[PDB]
C-alpha cells in the first residue's frame, strides 16, 4: 500500500489550492478505511483538515469547514482536497492519511487512529512569483582540506519558493553529504549549500557533479565542481 | 478544541537509557490517545493507538500508559532508530488534535569540528555579489560560535548561519556560516578569516585566505 501526494508548489493568495493523493495498494471504496488530510504548519503544529468515507460522508475541521472539500475519485483510486480563499497562513506540509474503520463488533471499536501516512507535499502561499536558483561551485583547495580528506560543494542561491532538492553524481554519491536547510535572505529569496567530504586522493580521477532541482520553477541544473590547486 | 501539551518539549538521551514522554490534556480523553513517530526522510508512522495498543512492526521497546487527562509513552532501551520526534493525539472529541511534539536527540561524546573555508566562485563575482562559506563538519555539542573577521575587523549582519539535523549514525551536527557581500566590498579588502569556538576545542580555530592568492 503506497500513498503518493502531489499538487502545485506555489499558490497565489485568494486562489484555490487542490492536492491529489494516489493510493497504490487497495481501493478507496474498501469501506474498511476512511481517508483523511492532515497538515503541518511551519512551527510543527499538526492540524487535521478533513475526513472522508467511501459512502460520501465528510468531516471538516470547523475552522476550515466554510472553504474545504474532500472527495474520492474511484475510477483512478485518488483522493482530492480543495482549499479555497487561501492565505499565507495555509503554507504547510500536506499529508494524505488512512484510518481503519473498526466495526461495531471489532475488539477495537470506537478507536480512531491514523495508521498509514503519505510522505507529504509542501505548499507555499505567496503573492511573490517563482524564481529559480543560481548554482555556484564551492571548489576544494588546500584551505578546504583537513588531513587526508577534502571538502567541496555547491551553493544554491536566490530561489523562491522552497524547496530545492540536491543530489551528487546522480545519486551514486551518498556518503558524508550535508545539504543544509535553507535560509531566508533579506531579498526574500532562499539559499542553501550542499557539501560533501571525499578523500583528497580522489580528486583528479573522480568527477563530482551536483544536481539541483527546483520543481516550482522547473529548474534542473548540473554543476561540475573542479579542484582548484590553491 | 481539546488542547494537548507534551513534556518535555525537547530532550536528549544516551543509547540504552529509558525515556518517558508525558502528554497532558485539557479534558479527560478516556484512553483515546494515539502516539506517532516523525523522522526526517520517512513518512510519519503510528506506533500506539488507544493508550496501550502496539501496531504491527513497532518494536516492543515502545509502550504506552495512562488514563484520564495524563498519558505517557515509554522507550525502554532507546536505539539509534528511535531518535525522532513523537506526537500524542486525542480521539475523544470531534476535532482531533495533536500535541506539540517531543524531540528526542542523542547524547554523545565531545567531538571537535573540522573547519573549512570557501572563497566566492568566479561565476558569482561575475554576477556582482560575493558569498564566502565557513563549514564546521561533524561536531558535538550543537553550541558553536562562528565569528567573521575581515582584515581583523568583526562583521555585523553580513552573514547567516545554518545547522543540519543530527546525523542518524554519526549523532553529530554540521554548520555553514555564509557571509554575503557586494563585489565592491569584497574587492576592497585582502584577508578573510573565519574563527570558530567550540567545546572540545582548546584554542579557537581560524581559517583564512588572501583574496587573489
Amino acid at each position: 500500500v503506497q500513498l503518493v501526494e502531489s499538487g502545485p508548489g506555489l499558490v497565489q493568495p485568494w486562489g484555490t489550492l487542490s492536492l491529489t493523493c494516489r493510493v497504490s495498494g487497495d481501493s478507496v471504496s474498501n469501506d474498511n478505511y476512511y481517508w483523511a488530510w492532515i497538515r503541518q504548519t511551519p512551527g510543527r503544529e499538526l492540524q487535521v483538515i478533513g475526513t472522508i468515507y467511501y459512502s460520501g460522508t465528510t468531516y471538516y475541521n470547523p475552522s476550515l469547514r466554510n472553504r474545504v472539500t474532500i472527495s474520492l475519485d474511484k475510477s483512478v483510486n485518488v483522493v482530492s482536497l480543495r482549499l479555497g480563499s487561501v492565505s499565507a497562513a495555509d503554507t504547510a506540509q500536506y499529508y494524505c492519511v488512512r484510518m481503519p474503520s473498526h466495526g461495531f463488533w471489532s475488539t477495537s471499536f470506537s478507536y480512531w487512529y491514523f495508521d498509514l501516512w503519505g510522505r507529504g507535499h509542501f505548499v507555499a502561499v505567496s503573492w511573490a512569483s517563482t524564481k529559480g536558483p543560481s548554482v555556484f561551485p564551492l571548489a576544494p583547495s588546500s584551505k578546504s582540506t583537513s588531513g587526508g580528506t577534502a571538502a567541496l560543494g555547491c551553493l544554491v542561491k536566490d530561489y523562491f519558493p522552497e524547496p530545492v532538492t540536491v543530489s551528487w553524481n546522480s545519486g551514486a554519491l551518498t556518503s558524508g553529504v550535508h545539504t543544509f536547510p535553507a535560509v531566508l535572505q533579506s531579498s526574500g529569496l532562499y539559499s542553501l549549500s550542499s557539501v560533501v567530504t571525499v578523500p583528497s586522493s580522489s580528486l583528479g580521477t573522480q568527477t563530482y557533479i551536483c544536481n539541483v532541482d527546483h520543481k516550482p520553477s522547473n529548474t534542473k541544473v548540473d554543476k561540475k565542481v573542479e579542484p582548484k590547486s590553491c | 478544541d481539546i488542547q494537548m501539551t507534551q513534556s518535555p518539549s525537547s530532550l536528549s538521551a544516551s543509547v540504552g537509557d529509558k525515556v518517558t514522554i508525558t502528554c497532558r490534556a485539557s479534558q479527560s480523553v478516556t484512553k483515546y490517545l494515539n502516539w506517532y513517530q516523525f523522522k526526517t526522510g520517512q513518512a510519519p508512522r503510528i506506533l500506539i493507538y488507544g493508550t496501550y495498543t502496539l501496531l504491527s512492526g513497532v518494536s516492543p521497546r515502545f509502550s504506552g500508559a495512562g488514563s484520564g487527562s495524563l498519558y505517557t509513552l515509554t522507550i525502554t532501551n532507546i536505539q539509534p532508530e528511535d531518535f525522532a520526534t513523537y506526537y500524542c493525539q486525542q480521539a475523544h472529541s470531534t476535532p482531533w488534535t495533536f500535541g506539540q511534539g517531543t524531540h528526542v536527540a542523542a547524547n554523545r561524546t565531545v567531538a571537535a569540528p573540522s573547519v573549512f573555508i570557501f572563497p566566492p566562485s568566479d561565476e558569482q563575482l561575475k554576477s556582482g555579489t560575493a558569498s564566502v562559506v565557513c563549514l564546521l563538519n561533524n561536531f558535538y555539542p550543537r553550541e558553536a560560535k562562528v565569528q567573521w573577521k575581515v582584515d581583523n575587523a568583526l562583521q555585523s549582519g553580513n552573514s547567516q548561519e545554518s545547522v543540519t539535523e543530527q546525523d542518524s549514525k554519526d549523532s553529530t551536527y554540521s554548520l555553514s556560516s555564509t557571509l554575503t557581500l557586494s563585489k565592491a566590498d569584497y574587492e576592497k579588502h585582502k584577508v578573510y578569516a573565519c574563527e570558530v569556538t567550540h567545546q572540545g576545542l582548546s584554542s579557537p580555530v581560524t581559517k583564512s585566505f588572501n583574496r587573489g592568492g
Binding site: Y59 | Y32, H92
Partner: peptide
C-alpha cells in the same frame, strides 16, 4: 460526528456484552 457517536456506542456495546 459519527466518530463522537462511537464514544457512547462503546458503552452501549458493553451493556450488551454483559448480558
Amino acid at each position: 460526528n459519527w466518530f463522537d457517536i462511537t464514544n457512547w456506542l462503546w458503552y452501549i456495546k458493553l451493556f450488551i456484552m454483559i448480558v
